[PDB]
CSV table of C-alpha atoms in Angstrom, one decimal:
chain,number,residue,atom,x,y,z
A,92,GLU,CA,10.4,5.3,28.8
A,93,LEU,CA,13.9,5.7,27.3
A,94,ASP,CA,15.5,3.5,24.7
A,95,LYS,CA,18.2,1.1,25.7
A,96,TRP,CA,21.0,3.2,24.3
A,97,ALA,CA,20.1,6.7,25.5
A,98,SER,CA,23.3,6.4,27.6
B,60,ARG,CA,26.8,-9.8,5.4
B,61,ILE,CA,23.6,-9.8,7.4
B,62,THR,CA,20.4,-11.0,5.9
B,63,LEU,CA,17.0,-11.8,7.5
B,64,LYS,CA,14.0,-13.7,6.2
B,65,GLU,CA,10.4,-13.7,7.6
B,66,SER,CA,8.4,-16.9,7.4
B,67,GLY,CA,4.9,-17.9,8.6
B,68,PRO,CA,1.4,-18.3,7.1
B,69,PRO,CA,0.4,-15.9,4.3
B,70,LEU,CA,-3.3,-16.5,5.3
B,71,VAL,CA,-4.8,-16.3,8.8
B,72,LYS,CA,-8.4,-16.4,10.0
B,73,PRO,CA,-9.8,-13.6,12.1
B,74,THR,CA,-9.5,-14.4,15.9
B,75,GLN,CA,-6.7,-16.9,15.4
B,76,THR,CA,-3.0,-16.5,16.3
B,77,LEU,CA,-0.4,-15.3,13.9
B,78,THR,CA,3.1,-16.8,14.4
B,79,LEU,CA,6.0,-15.2,12.6
B,80,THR,CA,9.6,-16.4,12.3
B,81,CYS,CA,12.6,-14.4,11.5
B,82,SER,CA,15.6,-16.4,10.3
B,83,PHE,CA,18.9,-14.5,9.9
B,84,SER,CA,22.6,-15.0,9.2
B,85,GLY,CA,25.6,-12.7,9.4
B,86,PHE,CA,25.2,-12.0,13.1
B,87,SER,CA,24.0,-13.9,16.1
B,88,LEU,CA,21.8,-13.0,19.0
B,89,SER,CA,24.7,-13.4,21.3
B,90,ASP,CA,26.7,-10.4,20.0
B,91,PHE,CA,26.5,-7.6,22.5
B,92,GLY,CA,23.5,-5.3,22.4
B,93,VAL,CA,22.2,-6.5,19.1
B,94,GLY,CA,18.4,-6.4,18.5
B,95,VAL,CA,15.9,-7.7,16.0
B,96,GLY,CA,12.7,-5.8,15.5
B,97,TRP,CA,9.3,-6.4,13.8
B,98,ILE,CA,7.8,-3.7,11.6
B,99,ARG,CA,4.5,-4.1,9.6
B,100,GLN,CA,3.0,-2.1,6.8
B,101,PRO,CA,-0.7,-2.3,5.7
B,102,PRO,CA,-1.3,-2.2,2.0
B,103,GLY,CA,-0.6,1.3,0.7
B,104,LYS,CA,0.1,2.6,4.2
B,105,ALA,CA,2.9,3.7,6.4
B,106,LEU,CA,5.3,1.5,8.5
B,107,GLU,CA,4.2,0.6,12.0
B,108,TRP,CA,6.6,-0.5,14.8
B,109,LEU,CA,5.6,-3.7,16.5
B,110,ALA,CA,8.2,-4.9,18.8
B,111,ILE,CA,11.9,-5.6,19.5
B,112,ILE,CA,14.0,-8.1,21.3
B,113,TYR,CA,17.7,-8.0,22.2
B,114,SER,CA,20.7,-10.2,22.9
B,115,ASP,CA,20.3,-10.0,26.7
B,116,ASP,CA,16.6,-10.7,26.1
B,117,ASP,CA,14.7,-7.6,27.0
B,118,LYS,CA,11.9,-6.8,24.7
B,119,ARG,CA,9.4,-4.0,24.1
B,120,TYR,CA,6.1,-4.1,22.4
B,121,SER,CA,4.0,-1.4,20.8
B,122,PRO,CA,1.8,-0.1,23.7
B,123,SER,CA,-1.3,-0.3,21.5
B,124,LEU,CA,-0.7,-4.0,20.7
B,125,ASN,CA,1.1,-5.4,23.8
B,126,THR,CA,-1.6,-7.7,25.2
B,127,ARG,CA,-1.7,-9.3,21.8
B,128,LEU,CA,2.1,-9.7,21.1
B,129,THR,CA,4.8,-12.0,22.3
B,130,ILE,CA,8.3,-11.9,21.0
B,131,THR,CA,10.9,-14.6,21.6
B,132,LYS,CA,14.3,-15.8,20.4
B,133,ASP,CA,15.8,-19.3,20.0
B,134,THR,CA,19.6,-18.7,19.7
B,135,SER,CA,20.7,-22.2,18.5
B,136,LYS,CA,18.2,-21.7,15.6
B,137,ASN,CA,19.2,-18.1,15.1
B,138,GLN,CA,15.5,-17.2,14.8
B,139,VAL,CA,13.2,-14.7,16.4
B,140,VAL,CA,9.5,-15.4,16.8
B,141,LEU,CA,6.5,-13.0,16.9
B,142,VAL,CA,3.1,-14.2,18.0
B,143,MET,CA,0.1,-11.9,17.4
B,144,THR,CA,-3.3,-13.0,18.8
B,145,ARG,CA,-6.9,-12.4,17.8
B,146,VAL,CA,-6.0,-11.0,14.4
B,147,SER,CA,-8.6,-9.2,12.3
B,148,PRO,CA,-8.6,-7.9,8.7
B,149,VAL,CA,-7.0,-4.7,9.9
B,150,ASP,CA,-3.9,-6.8,10.7
B,151,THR,CA,-3.6,-7.6,7.0
B,152,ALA,CA,-0.2,-6.2,6.0
B,153,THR,CA,3.4,-7.0,5.1
B,154,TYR,CA,5.5,-7.9,8.1
B,155,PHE,CA,9.2,-7.2,8.2
B,156,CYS,CA,11.8,-8.2,10.7
B,157,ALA,CA,15.0,-6.1,10.9
B,158,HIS,CA,18.4,-6.0,12.5
B,159,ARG,CA,19.7,-3.3,14.9
B,160,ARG,CA,23.4,-2.8,15.6
B,161,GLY,CA,24.7,-2.9,19.2
B,162,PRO,CA,27.3,-0.5,20.7
B,163,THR,CA,30.8,-1.1,19.2
B,164,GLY,CA,26.5,5.7,18.0
B,165,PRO,CA,25.0,3.9,14.9
B,166,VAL,CA,22.7,1.8,17.0
B,167,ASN,CA,20.3,4.6,15.9
B,168,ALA,CA,18.6,2.8,13.0
B,169,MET,CA,17.5,-0.6,11.8
B,170,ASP,CA,20.3,-1.2,9.3
B,171,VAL,CA,19.3,-4.4,7.5
B,172,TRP,CA,15.7,-5.5,6.7
B,173,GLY,CA,14.1,-8.8,5.7
B,174,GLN,CA,12.2,-8.7,2.4
B,175,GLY,CA,9.0,-8.9,4.3
B,176,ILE,CA,6.2,-11.5,4.3
B,177,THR,CA,2.7,-10.4,3.4
B,178,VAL,CA,0.0,-11.8,5.5
B,179,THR,CA,-3.7,-11.5,4.7
B,180,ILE,CA,-6.4,-11.9,7.3
B,181,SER,CA,-9.6,-13.3,5.9
B,182,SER,CA,-12.2,-16.0,6.8
B,183,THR,CA,-12.7,-17.0,3.3
B,184,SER,CA,-12.0,-20.1,1.3
B,185,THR,CA,-10.5,-20.5,-2.1
B,186,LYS,CA,-13.0,-19.1,-4.6
B,187,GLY,CA,-12.9,-18.2,-8.3
B,188,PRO,CA,-14.0,-14.8,-9.6
B,189,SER,CA,-17.1,-13.8,-11.5
B,190,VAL,CA,-16.3,-11.6,-14.4
B,191,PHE,CA,-18.6,-8.8,-15.3
B,192,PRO,CA,-18.5,-6.3,-18.2
B,193,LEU,CA,-17.7,-2.6,-17.7
B,194,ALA,CA,-19.2,-1.2,-20.8
B,195,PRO,CA,-19.8,2.2,-22.5
B,196,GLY,CA,-13.4,9.9,-29.7
B,197,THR,CA,-11.9,8.0,-26.8
B,198,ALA,CA,-13.9,5.2,-25.1
B,199,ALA,CA,-13.3,3.1,-22.1
B,200,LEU,CA,-14.4,-0.5,-21.3
B,201,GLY,CA,-13.3,-3.1,-19.0
B,202,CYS,CA,-14.0,-6.1,-16.7
B,203,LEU,CA,-14.9,-6.3,-13.1
B,204,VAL,CA,-13.3,-9.3,-11.6
B,205,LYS,CA,-15.3,-9.9,-8.5
B,206,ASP,CA,-15.4,-12.0,-5.4
B,207,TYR,CA,-12.3,-14.2,-5.6
B,208,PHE,CA,-9.9,-15.5,-3.0
B,209,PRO,CA,-7.0,-15.5,-2.5
B,210,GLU,CA,-4.9,-13.2,-4.5
B,211,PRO,CA,-3.7,-13.1,-7.1
B,212,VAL,CA,-5.5,-13.0,-10.4
B,213,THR,CA,-4.1,-12.2,-13.9
B,214,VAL,CA,-5.8,-10.2,-16.5
B,215,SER,CA,-4.9,-9.6,-20.1
B,216,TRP,CA,-6.8,-8.2,-23.1
B,217,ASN,CA,-7.3,-10.0,-26.4
B,218,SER,CA,-4.9,-12.8,-25.3
B,219,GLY,CA,-2.1,-10.3,-24.8
B,220,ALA,CA,-2.5,-8.7,-28.3
B,221,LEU,CA,-3.9,-5.5,-26.6
B,222,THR,CA,-1.6,-3.7,-24.0
B,223,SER,CA,-1.6,0.0,-24.4
B,224,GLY,CA,-4.4,1.9,-22.8
B,225,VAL,CA,-4.8,-0.9,-20.3
B,226,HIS,CA,-4.9,-0.3,-16.5
B,227,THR,CA,-5.4,-3.2,-14.2
B,228,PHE,CA,-6.1,-1.8,-10.8
B,229,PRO,CA,-4.9,-3.1,-7.4
B,230,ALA,CA,-7.5,-5.4,-6.1
B,231,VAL,CA,-9.4,-4.3,-2.9
B,232,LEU,CA,-10.2,-6.7,-0.1
B,233,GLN,CA,-13.9,-6.2,0.5
B,234,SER,CA,-15.7,-6.4,3.9
B,235,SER,CA,-16.8,-9.8,2.8
B,236,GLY,CA,-13.2,-11.0,2.9
B,237,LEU,CA,-13.2,-11.5,-0.8
B,238,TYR,CA,-11.2,-9.6,-3.5
B,239,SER,CA,-12.5,-7.4,-6.3
B,240,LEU,CA,-10.5,-5.7,-9.0
B,241,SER,CA,-11.2,-4.0,-12.2
B,242,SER,CA,-9.2,-3.9,-15.3
B,243,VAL,CA,-10.1,-1.2,-17.8
B,244,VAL,CA,-8.8,-0.3,-21.2
B,245,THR,CA,-9.3,2.9,-23.1
B,246,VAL,CA,-9.8,2.6,-26.9
B,247,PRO,CA,-11.0,4.7,-29.9
B,248,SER,CA,-14.8,5.1,-30.1
B,249,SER,CA,-14.6,4.2,-33.8
B,250,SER,CA,-13.1,0.9,-32.9
B,251,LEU,CA,-16.1,-0.1,-30.8
B,252,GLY,CA,-18.1,-1.6,-33.7
B,253,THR,CA,-15.4,-3.4,-35.6
B,254,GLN,CA,-12.8,-4.4,-32.9
B,255,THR,CA,-13.6,-6.9,-30.2
B,256,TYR,CA,-12.6,-6.6,-26.5
B,257,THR,CA,-12.2,-9.6,-24.3
B,258,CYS,CA,-10.6,-9.7,-20.9
B,259,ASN,CA,-8.9,-13.0,-20.0
B,260,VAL,CA,-9.1,-13.7,-16.3
B,261,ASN,CA,-7.1,-16.4,-14.5
B,262,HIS,CA,-7.3,-17.2,-10.8
B,263,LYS,CA,-4.8,-20.1,-10.4
B,264,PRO,CA,-5.5,-20.5,-6.7
B,265,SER,CA,-9.0,-21.9,-7.6
B,266,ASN,CA,-8.3,-22.4,-11.3
B,267,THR,CA,-11.2,-20.4,-12.5
B,268,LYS,CA,-10.3,-19.1,-16.0
B,269,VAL,CA,-12.8,-16.9,-17.7
B,270,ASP,CA,-12.8,-15.1,-21.1
B,271,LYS,CA,-15.3,-12.2,-21.0
B,272,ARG,CA,-16.2,-10.3,-24.1
B,273,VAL,CA,-17.4,-6.7,-23.7
B,274,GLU,CA,-18.4,-4.3,-26.6
B,275,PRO,CA,-21.2,-2.0,-25.2
C,2,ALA,CA,3.3,8.4,22.5
C,3,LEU,CA,5.9,10.5,20.7
C,4,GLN,CA,4.4,11.9,17.5
C,5,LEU,CA,6.7,12.1,14.5
C,6,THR,CA,5.3,14.4,11.8
C,7,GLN,CA,6.7,14.1,8.4
C,8,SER,CA,6.3,16.8,5.8
C,9,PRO,CA,5.4,17.4,3.1
C,10,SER,CA,3.5,14.1,3.1
C,11,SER,CA,3.6,14.1,-0.7
C,12,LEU,CA,6.1,15.8,-3.0
C,13,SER,CA,6.4,16.2,-6.8
C,14,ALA,CA,9.8,16.5,-8.4
C,15,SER,CA,12.0,15.8,-11.5
C,16,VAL,CA,15.3,14.1,-12.0
C,17,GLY,CA,18.1,16.5,-11.1
C,18,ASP,CA,16.0,18.3,-8.6
C,19,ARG,CA,17.2,19.2,-5.1
C,20,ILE,CA,14.7,18.5,-2.4
C,21,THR,CA,14.6,18.6,1.4
C,22,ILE,CA,12.0,16.7,3.5
C,23,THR,CA,11.4,17.0,7.2
C,24,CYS,CA,10.4,14.9,10.2
C,25,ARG,CA,9.7,16.5,13.4
C,26,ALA,CA,9.1,15.0,16.9
C,27,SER,CA,6.7,16.0,19.6
C,28,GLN,CA,9.5,15.4,22.2
C,29,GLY,CA,13.2,15.6,21.8
C,30,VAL,CA,14.8,12.4,20.6
C,31,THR,CA,18.4,13.7,20.6
C,32,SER,CA,20.2,12.2,17.5
C,33,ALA,CA,18.4,8.9,17.5
C,34,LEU,CA,16.6,9.3,14.2
C,35,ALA,CA,17.0,7.2,11.0
C,36,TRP,CA,15.9,7.8,7.4
C,37,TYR,CA,14.8,5.1,5.0
C,38,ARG,CA,13.9,5.0,1.3
C,39,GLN,CA,11.3,2.4,0.3
C,40,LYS,CA,10.5,1.5,-3.3
C,41,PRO,CA,7.2,-0.2,-4.1
C,42,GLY,CA,7.4,-3.9,-3.5
C,43,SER,CA,10.7,-3.7,-1.6
C,44,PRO,CA,11.5,-3.4,2.1
C,45,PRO,CA,12.8,-0.1,3.7
C,46,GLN,CA,16.4,0.7,3.1
C,47,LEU,CA,18.6,2.6,5.6
C,48,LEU,CA,20.1,5.9,4.3
C,49,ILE,CA,20.9,7.9,7.4
C,50,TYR,CA,21.5,6.6,10.9
C,51,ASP,CA,21.8,8.7,14.1
C,52,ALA,CA,20.4,11.8,12.3
C,53,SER,CA,23.4,12.8,10.2
C,54,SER,CA,25.6,9.7,9.5
C,55,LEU,CA,25.5,8.4,6.0
C,56,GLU,CA,25.0,4.6,6.1
C,57,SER,CA,27.9,2.7,4.4
C,58,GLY,CA,27.0,2.1,0.8
C,59,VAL,CA,24.5,4.8,0.5
C,60,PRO,CA,25.0,7.4,-2.3
C,61,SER,CA,26.6,10.7,-1.3
C,62,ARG,CA,23.7,12.7,-2.7
C,63,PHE,CA,21.8,11.7,0.5
C,64,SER,CA,22.4,13.7,3.7
C,65,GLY,CA,20.7,14.3,7.0
C,66,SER,CA,20.8,17.0,9.7
C,67,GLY,CA,19.0,18.0,12.8
C,68,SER,CA,18.7,17.1,16.5
C,69,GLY,CA,16.1,17.3,19.2
C,70,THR,CA,12.8,17.8,17.5
C,71,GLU,CA,13.8,18.9,14.0
C,72,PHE,CA,15.3,16.7,11.3
C,73,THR,CA,15.8,16.9,7.5
C,74,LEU,CA,16.9,14.6,4.7
C,75,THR,CA,18.2,16.2,1.6
C,76,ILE,CA,18.8,14.7,-1.9
C,77,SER,CA,21.3,16.9,-3.7
C,78,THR,CA,20.3,15.6,-7.1
C,79,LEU,CA,17.2,13.4,-7.6
C,80,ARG,CA,17.6,10.2,-9.5
C,81,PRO,CA,15.1,7.8,-11.0
C,82,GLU,CA,15.6,5.3,-8.2
C,83,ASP,CA,14.7,8.0,-5.7
C,84,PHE,CA,11.0,8.4,-6.7
C,85,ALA,CA,9.8,6.4,-3.7
C,86,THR,CA,8.5,6.9,-0.2
C,87,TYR,CA,10.7,8.0,2.6
C,88,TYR,CA,10.3,7.4,6.3
C,89,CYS,CA,12.0,8.6,9.4
C,90,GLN,CA,12.1,6.6,12.7
C,91,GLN,CA,13.2,7.7,16.2
C,92,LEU,CA,14.9,5.1,18.4
C,93,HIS,CA,15.3,7.3,21.5
C,94,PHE,CA,12.0,6.3,23.3
C,95,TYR,CA,9.9,3.2,23.2
C,96,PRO,CA,8.0,2.5,21.2
C,97,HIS,CA,10.2,3.3,18.2
C,98,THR,CA,8.0,5.5,16.1
C,99,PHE,CA,8.0,5.8,12.3
C,100,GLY,CA,6.7,9.0,10.6
C,101,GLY,CA,3.8,8.8,8.2
C,102,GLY,CA,6.2,8.9,5.2
C,103,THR,CA,7.0,11.3,2.4
C,104,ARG,CA,6.0,10.3,-1.1
C,105,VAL,CA,8.3,11.5,-4.0
C,106,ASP,CA,6.9,11.0,-7.5
C,107,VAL,CA,7.7,12.2,-11.0
C,108,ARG,CA,6.6,15.7,-11.9
C,109,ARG,CA,4.8,16.4,-15.2
C,110,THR,CA,2.2,18.9,-16.3
C,111,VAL,CA,-1.2,18.8,-14.5
C,112,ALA,CA,-3.5,16.4,-16.3
C,113,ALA,CA,-7.2,16.3,-15.6
C,114,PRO,CA,-8.7,12.8,-15.4
C,115,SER,CA,-11.0,11.4,-18.1
C,116,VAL,CA,-14.0,10.1,-16.2
C,117,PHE,CA,-16.3,7.2,-17.2
C,118,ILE,CA,-19.1,5.6,-15.2
C,119,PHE,CA,-20.2,2.0,-15.7
C,120,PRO,CA,-23.6,0.7,-14.6
C,121,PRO,CA,-23.8,-2.7,-13.0
C,122,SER,CA,-24.3,-5.6,-15.4
C,123,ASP,CA,-27.6,-7.5,-15.8
C,124,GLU,CA,-25.8,-10.7,-15.1
C,125,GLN,CA,-24.4,-9.4,-11.8
C,126,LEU,CA,-27.8,-8.0,-10.9
C,127,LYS,CA,-29.3,-11.4,-10.2
C,128,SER,CA,-26.3,-12.6,-8.1
C,129,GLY,CA,-28.1,-10.2,-5.8
C,130,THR,CA,-25.9,-7.1,-5.9
C,131,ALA,CA,-24.9,-4.2,-8.1
C,132,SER,CA,-21.5,-2.8,-8.5
C,133,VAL,CA,-21.3,0.5,-10.3
C,134,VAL,CA,-17.8,1.7,-11.0
C,135,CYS,CA,-16.2,5.1,-11.8
C,136,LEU,CA,-12.9,5.4,-13.7
C,137,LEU,CA,-10.6,8.4,-13.4
C,138,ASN,CA,-8.1,7.9,-16.2
C,139,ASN,CA,-4.6,9.2,-16.6
C,140,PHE,CA,-4.5,12.3,-14.4
C,141,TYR,CA,-1.8,14.2,-12.5
C,142,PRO,CA,-1.3,15.1,-9.7
C,143,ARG,CA,-2.2,11.9,-7.7
C,144,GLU,CA,-4.7,13.6,-5.3
C,145,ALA,CA,-8.2,13.0,-6.6
C,146,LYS,CA,-11.6,12.9,-5.0
C,147,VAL,CA,-14.6,10.7,-6.0
C,148,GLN,CA,-18.1,11.3,-4.7
C,149,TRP,CA,-21.0,9.0,-5.3
C,150,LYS,CA,-24.5,10.1,-5.5
C,151,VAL,CA,-27.7,8.2,-5.9
C,152,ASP,CA,-30.8,10.3,-6.6
C,153,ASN,CA,-28.7,13.1,-5.3
C,154,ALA,CA,-28.1,11.4,-1.9
C,155,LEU,CA,-24.4,11.5,-1.0
C,156,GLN,CA,-23.2,7.9,-0.6
C,157,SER,CA,-20.9,7.0,2.2
C,158,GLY,CA,-19.2,3.9,3.5
C,159,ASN,CA,-20.2,1.7,0.6
C,160,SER,CA,-17.5,2.3,-2.0
C,161,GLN,CA,-13.9,1.3,-2.3
C,162,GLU,CA,-11.3,2.4,-4.7
C,163,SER,CA,-7.7,1.8,-5.7
C,164,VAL,CA,-5.0,3.7,-7.7
C,165,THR,CA,-2.4,2.5,-10.1
C,166,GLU,CA,1.3,3.1,-9.8
C,167,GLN,CA,2.6,6.2,-11.6
C,168,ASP,CA,2.9,5.3,-15.3
C,169,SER,CA,6.5,4.8,-16.4
C,170,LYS,CA,5.9,6.5,-19.7
C,171,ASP,CA,3.4,9.3,-19.2
C,172,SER,CA,3.7,9.8,-15.4
C,173,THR,CA,-0.1,9.7,-14.8
C,174,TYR,CA,-2.3,7.9,-12.3
C,175,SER,CA,-5.6,6.2,-12.8
C,176,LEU,CA,-8.2,5.5,-10.2
C,177,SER,CA,-11.1,3.1,-9.9
C,178,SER,CA,-13.9,3.5,-7.5
C,179,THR,CA,-16.7,0.9,-6.9
C,180,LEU,CA,-20.0,1.7,-5.3
C,181,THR,CA,-21.7,-1.5,-4.1
C,182,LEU,CA,-25.5,-1.8,-3.5
C,183,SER,CA,-27.9,-4.6,-3.0
C,184,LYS,CA,-30.0,-5.1,-6.1
C,185,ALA,CA,-33.2,-4.0,-4.4
C,186,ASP,CA,-31.6,-0.7,-3.5
C,187,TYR,CA,-30.2,-0.3,-7.0
C,188,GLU,CA,-33.7,-0.8,-8.5
C,189,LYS,CA,-35.3,1.8,-6.2
C,190,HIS,CA,-33.2,4.7,-7.4
C,191,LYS,CA,-32.7,6.4,-10.7
C,192,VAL,CA,-29.7,8.7,-11.2
C,193,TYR,CA,-26.3,7.2,-10.5
C,194,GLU,CA,-23.6,9.8,-10.4
C,195,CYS,CA,-19.9,10.0,-10.0
C,196,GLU,CA,-18.4,13.4,-9.1
C,197,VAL,CA,-14.7,13.9,-9.5
C,198,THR,CA,-12.7,16.6,-7.9
C,199,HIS,CA,-9.2,17.2,-9.2
C,200,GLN,CA,-6.7,20.0,-9.6
C,201,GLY,CA,-7.1,20.0,-13.3
C,202,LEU,CA,-10.9,20.5,-13.3
C,203,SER,CA,-12.0,24.1,-12.7
C,204,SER,CA,-15.3,22.7,-11.4
C,205,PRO,CA,-16.1,19.1,-10.2
C,206,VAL,CA,-17.2,16.7,-13.0
C,207,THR,CA,-20.3,14.5,-12.8
C,208,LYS,CA,-20.9,11.4,-14.9
C,209,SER,CA,-24.3,9.9,-14.4
C,210,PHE,CA,-26.8,7.4,-15.8
C,211,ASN,CA,-30.5,6.7,-15.1
C,212,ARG,CA,-31.0,3.1,-14.3
C,213,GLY,CA,-33.7,2.0,-16.7
C,214,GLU,CA,-32.6,4.4,-19.5
C-alpha cells in the first residue's frame, strides 16, 4: 500500500 | 525546537507486554499531517521500522509484528504510546520514537529523533558475576566476568594504574539470560614474573565487587 | 515488502576522502528516501530528506541524488565525525523500510590479529561449565572469522563473541570469542583449537591446547 503522502 | 523522549521499563520478562511512551515538545499531534514513529535497533544491528501514528489518527504497523503492536496517542499529554506483546530476547534493543513533518515535500524523512531507550528482555534476577582468570615477547591475560545481571559492570586493571593494552569487550547476553564479558590486557612476557595483574570487577546492580589476580 | 539494499555495507576511508554510498529499492519509491548518520551511542540524525534536499543545519559536504530505485549519498570531504554508520529509509510505501546500513570507519594499514587462546579455569570447572576464550587482538580491517574445533570437530552454535570499537589511537579492532561447554564434555576431549581467518593472514592461524597438558 502507498504512504499517506504519495499525493 | 522539537524534542522527543522515550520512557518505559528497561527490563522486561519474556512473554510479557512492553509499554513505551514517547513524550515530545515543540509540536503537537494536532498540527496537520504530523506523525510520530517508532524505530528499534538491536545491539550492533540495523534500524528496524515498527510503527507510526498521525495527527488524524491513522496508524500503520510493521507487517511482521502487527498482531503484537498497538500504537496510541493522548493529545492532552502530548505523548504517543507503543505496546508490544509477548516479547522475547530477540526484542532486546534500543527503541526510538521520532517526528515526521506534515505537508506545509520534506515529509519524506523522520527529521527529529528521541535519544532512544534501551530495553533488555530477560527472565533473570539481579545477580553478581563470577570472575575467572584468562591466563597464558608480548603476552595476553585477562578476566572472564561471567553470569551477571543486569548490565552494567565496570572493569579496571591494577586499580586504574594499568590502562594501555587493555580491551574490555562488549558483554554478550547469553541464552541463559545472563551476561558475560571479558576484559583482556596485553603485556610484556618479561613482566609476567615480576609484575602483578588484577582485574577489579564491580557490578553495582547487585553490588558484587571482586578483585581477581591472574599471572599464569 | 520493499527491499532496500545498501552498499557497500562496510567501507574504509580517511579524513579528506570523497566517498559515495548507495541505497537501492526493489520497487520505485519516487523521491521519498531519507539519509541518516548514526554515531555509536547516539540516535540517527537526518542529513537528506526527499532524496536530494539537504536538511537544515546539515553540513554542505553532504549531498544526495537519485529517484525511483537508485539513490546515493556523497560526502565531499570526510571528517572525523563522519566515521559512523549511515542508513537510508523510504517513506513511499508502508511499511517504511530502512536499509541495512553503511559502515564508515578509519582506514589504516592492514594489521593481522595477535591470537591467544585461554583454557577454562579450574575454579569455573566445578561450577559445572567450561568457557574457553579466543582473543583476536588489534587487527584491521574489522572482518574476521573465528572457528572453534574440539578434537578436530568443528564447533557450531555454542560460542558467542563481541568486538570492540575502532581504537581512537591505532584504529584497530579486537575480538573476543567464547566457546561454552558443559564440564563433562570438556573433560572428554583433548585438543581445543581456535582458528582465525583474517585478511592479514596468508593462511588461517590455529591456537590450541591439550586439556590435561
